[PDB]
Amino acid sequence: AQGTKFRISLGLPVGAIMNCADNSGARNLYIIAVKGSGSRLNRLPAASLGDMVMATVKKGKPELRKKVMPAIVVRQAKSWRRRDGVFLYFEDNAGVIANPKGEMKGSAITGPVGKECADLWPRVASNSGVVV
Amino acid sequence: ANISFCRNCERFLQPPGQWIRAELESRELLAICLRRLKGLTKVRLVDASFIWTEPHSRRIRIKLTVQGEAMTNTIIQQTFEVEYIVIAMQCPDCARSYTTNTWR
Amino acid sequence: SHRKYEAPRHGHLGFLPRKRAASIRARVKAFPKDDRSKPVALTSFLGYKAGMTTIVRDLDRPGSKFHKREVVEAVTVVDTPPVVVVGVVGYVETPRGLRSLTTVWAEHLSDEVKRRFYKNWYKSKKKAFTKYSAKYAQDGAGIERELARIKKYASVVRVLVHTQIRKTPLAQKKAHLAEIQLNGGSISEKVDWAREHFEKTVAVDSVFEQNEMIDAIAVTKGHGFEGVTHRWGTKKLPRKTHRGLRKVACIGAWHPAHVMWSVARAGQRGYHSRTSINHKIYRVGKGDDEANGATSFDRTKKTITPMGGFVHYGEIKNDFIMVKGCIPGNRKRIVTLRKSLYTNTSRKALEEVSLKWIDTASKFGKGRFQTPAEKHAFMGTLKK
Amino acid sequence: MKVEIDSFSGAKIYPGRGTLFVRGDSKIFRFQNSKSASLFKQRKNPRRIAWTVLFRKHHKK
RNA sequence: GCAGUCAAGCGUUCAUAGCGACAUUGCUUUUUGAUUCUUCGAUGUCGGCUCUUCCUAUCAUACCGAAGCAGAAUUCGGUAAGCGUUGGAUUGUUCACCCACUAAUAGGGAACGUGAGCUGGGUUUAGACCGUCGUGAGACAGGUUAGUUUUACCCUACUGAUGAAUGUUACCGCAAUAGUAAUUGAACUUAGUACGAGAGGAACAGUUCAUUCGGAUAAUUGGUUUUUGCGGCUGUCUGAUCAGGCAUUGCCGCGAAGCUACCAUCCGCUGGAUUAUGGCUGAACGCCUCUAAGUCAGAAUCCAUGCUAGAACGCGGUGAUUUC
RNA sequence: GUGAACAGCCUCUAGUUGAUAGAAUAAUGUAGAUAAGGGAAGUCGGCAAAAUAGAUCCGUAACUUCGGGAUAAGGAUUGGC
């Protein structure tokens, strides 16, 4: 379900509590796995900017909690290399929640969204106010 | 899914350690839906029945309705049928009798 | 008992033994396949790696996401002085392999090649090639018999060349000698090529052209006796281990009661011979030009030597080859460049590149100016 | 090829050099090296650091 | 545990497409028993972590055969161990059991691999409480707590490192033999096309990237700081100022050179011969047949090209060879 | 002298300058360290380390044998002249 993305550095292992970017009621998301990750003995699977992860709500509305639902990383604090040359990194991690088809439940996203996340997912680029 | 039973006891295995026996009605149906891997998430139950197909073929078919929830206010009921391959092994309690250490 | 968690192997088994190489010049194991319909040229070359710098080019690759986009990329600059031929050597074929038959050296030899034949030059009477040079001094019948021996017999022909070390900022005065096989046609013609090129220079641009896939053969950077974790990439033990944690726990089972050849063990790391393939040539610059660093999109007069020179090497004021990505072997190392063994097609060989900009800032750390002509325009008038 | 100026002090940034920083209110900060990138995190004022171009523009050097 | 043969009941009407109980003939040592052969002048007796290699009774991957195979999705069988087989909650766990990813989360052996490799949770010393039993000391493999893990410098093995002797000495090569490495997945396109009553819904070639693994490498970005390089600060000491000592590297910011990381970039080749199966010609048997004589195509296989080492008792070509 | 102090750190009187030494700076140890992003996913178990800390001011819950809990929690401030 995921299109082609150039490799960027892995900055969110399993267990990372990242912020929640949209206004769907949640406050933070707890990454438990990454769609399309690999397999190695004692290696933790990790997420990057633009990956689809499975994530649970630890704080927010009581309707959303205690169930697993997929989500999309939109910001990242670990620096990655763009092909034009500059190394960039945001201030904090963030994630919006979505269905497994990729459509977003949220209405609008606060703060900026990474550019390589906007090209990879169409519905994220609709809700995005600021793209980098 | 898979159900283990004994060919010398004819007695079904509950997955932790137990050995609830077989009536194929009203008590065998109870153990067989805990193994159904469905979760209590969205069914809570609707109705369950099984199909006759064959006595000696090691497959038991069950059909069940769910009555789950899809949208914010939509309760909805659908149905489907599951086919359990039944795997034969030993009862350690009743493979013990072949060792002459029977009484204890 | 079985293994209880499958995991792929640490290390590669086709690169054993990790022992020190026999010499700093790594040998070319295999030369490309000859095609005798084509004219005579060389098949490999010698040079000295200097350093690395950054490049920017417009990527032209259809169906990609970065199409017609600037990409920064890492290149190496190998200092490549002109190489002069001193002799030819012809090989006949046996059932036991290829056997050397006759090597014919030229008349005059420089002082650089004579350094190779001696271990104590200053005490030596410098008597190498004195009785050989008297053969040319007469009518020359002793040598025309020898090249006619190679024309009749001798399936393949190599050519002994050597680098010019005086045109290079190394402190070494001794030249490096090597064989290079020719891949022209009709081996009576190969030896007539080398006959005319005795004590004649061979430039770089005649051998290699731009946008060509080549290989790189040299001796790896050495590191000395290293431990089993950094040598193979094996797992560190936990913190609570008595007497060591940077080790490998189980050497092997009971049976067989011998340490197997496949387990990981500490030893020599580095200074191996490696062949790396598929490195793409970006720029073949000449020596007598102040525009080595210039580009059609840059239009500034500078050489590719950075501000303050390359670290540990010096000044590139010669011909050079600028090839994409890292090369095995550190700086100052004698490096062989070989043509590709097979014709490549896929998409990446046939692509032609034109640069945007060459990075010439100081490599000696956190450099922020490209040329000292424009450092003075930024900071202005200083005290000194 | 564009040469961007340093956000902190004054320096020219050739392509493939230094870092970039996007603050949480969507403002882009460029840095030439880790010197001005580490002094930015200390909340230091670049009008009072002596080696910056922003200082020497102010006190008329 | 596992595989044959025989094929009851079934698969709406059809013994064998496919499930298959019961009878019958065998194999294996990954169970549980039986035995007492070796060891009681001691083979350190559970599990986990770490690491290599072997097996095939194949979960995935490659190429095929059969179906109650239209497509899609499956199910059954052949060659085949080249290559891959995970991240977590609870339990001392082996075993189990759920959660989530994935091409897939296959089964096993090597003194039930591996304690002078570790850890000591468990078990199996001495302390102590409980419960039932006992008149009493005490019993319980019932439950729960606290409890020292010793030596390698010797020899072989392996990993690296020198070396006498072949007239001396220097340089350039040949290649006997041993090793060998790459692996998988998505996306677009082919195409909403073939197929289909529809609902639904492909593949080969092509393009672009990614997973696992491997070799290197330091331009750039990040890490490290005894450059004690420059600057800052506290307490004391040299009368103050300068310039310094001491605080087992006094601390803090920055910090080049070096080493270094999927925390960084780069690179990872194409030919022959076959297995499983599909064919040609063609008898045995006036027909028919892939097979008997011959022969064509064909797998992640085998051998080469390529890659690493270079026999210290494998060898060749050249330079100079001690009047003085 | 600093400081709440016979704590720690430095100096005066007095004492000692003894503890086999030289040269290089591989592996693996011992002792002391720092680390990008994530933060117990490690493990029988947060073992080990890290963070917190001195002072003045504000503010302090349940429970209770009314004594306590209590430095509870939590939040500011500190040089120099």
Contact residues, chain C, for A87 at CB < 8 Å = none
Q: Strand, coil or helix: what is C196?
A: helix
| Cβ of A15 near strand F (distance < 7 A) | yes
Smallest CA-to-CA distance from C363 within D17, B55, A119, B1 is with: D17
Q: What angle do CA A90, A96, A102 make, to 5 degrees?
A: 120
CATH 2.40.30.10 for the C16-81+203-220+270-384 domain, yes or no? yes
Q: What is the DSSP string of C333-384?
A: -EEEEEE-SS---SSSSS----EEEE--S-TTTT---S-HHHHHHHH-S---
Which pair of structure tokens corresponds to residue A87? Answer: 């190394």
- CB contact at 8 A, C67 and C312: no
- What is the C-alpha to C-alpha distance for residues D35 and D10, in angstroms, rounded to an integer? 13
- Pseudo-torsion of CA C201, C207, C210, C214, nearest 10°? -130
Inter-chain contact D35–C370, Cβ cutoff 8 Å? no
| Domain map (residue ranges) of chain A | 11-132
Q: What share of chain A is helix, strand, coil (3-state, %, to 5)?
A: 10, 35, 55
Residue among A84, A85, A112 minimizing CB distance to D22 = A112
Q: Strand, coil or helix: what is C194?
A: helix
Contact residues, chain C, for A40 at CB < 8 Å = 7-8
Q: Which residues contact A98 (CB under 8 A, 6 or more apart)?
A: A52, A70, A71, A72, A104, A105, A123
In chain C, CATH 3.30.1430.10 sits at 82-202
Residue among C5, C8, C71 minimizing CB distance to A83 = C71
Smallest CA-to-CA distance from C48 within C93, C83, C15, C21 is with: C83
CATH top-level class for C82-202?
alpha beta
Inter-chain contact C7–A40, Cβ cutoff 8 Å? yes
- Maximal C-alpha separation, chain A: 44
CATH topology for A11-132 is: Ribosomal Protein L14 (2.40.150)
Resolution in angstroms for this experimental structure?
A: 3.5
- Maximal C-alpha separation, chain D: 35
Q: Which residues contact B22 (CB under 8 A, 6 or more apart)?
A: B5, B10, B11, B12, B28
Name the closest nucleotide to C342, judged by C1' and CA: E269
Inter-chain contact D15–C297, Cβ cutoff 8 Å? no
Smallest CA-to-CA distance from C84 within C173, C198, C242 is with: C198
Distances (CA, A) of C200 to C110, C166, C336, C359: 12, 16, 20, 35
Which amino acid, residue C188?
S
In chain C, CATH 2.40.30.10 sits at 16-81+203-220+270-384
Q: Which residues contact C230 (CB under 8 A, 6 or more apart)?
A: C269
Which pair of structure tokens corresponds to residue C93? Answer: 């074929």
> Please, is C383 exposed, middle or buried when counting C-beta atoms within 10 Å of its C-beta (0-12, 13-18, 19+)?
exposed
Q: Which residues contact C84 (CB under 8 A, 6 or more apart)?
A: C110, C161, C162, C164, C199, C200, C201, C202
Smallest CA-to-CA distance from A77 within D34, D42, D22, D25 is with: D22
- What is the C-alpha to C-alpha distance for residues D41 and C26, in angstroms, rounded to an integer? 49
Way it was determined: cryo-EM
- What is the C-alpha to C-alpha distance for residues D6 and D26, in angstroms, rounded to an integer? 17
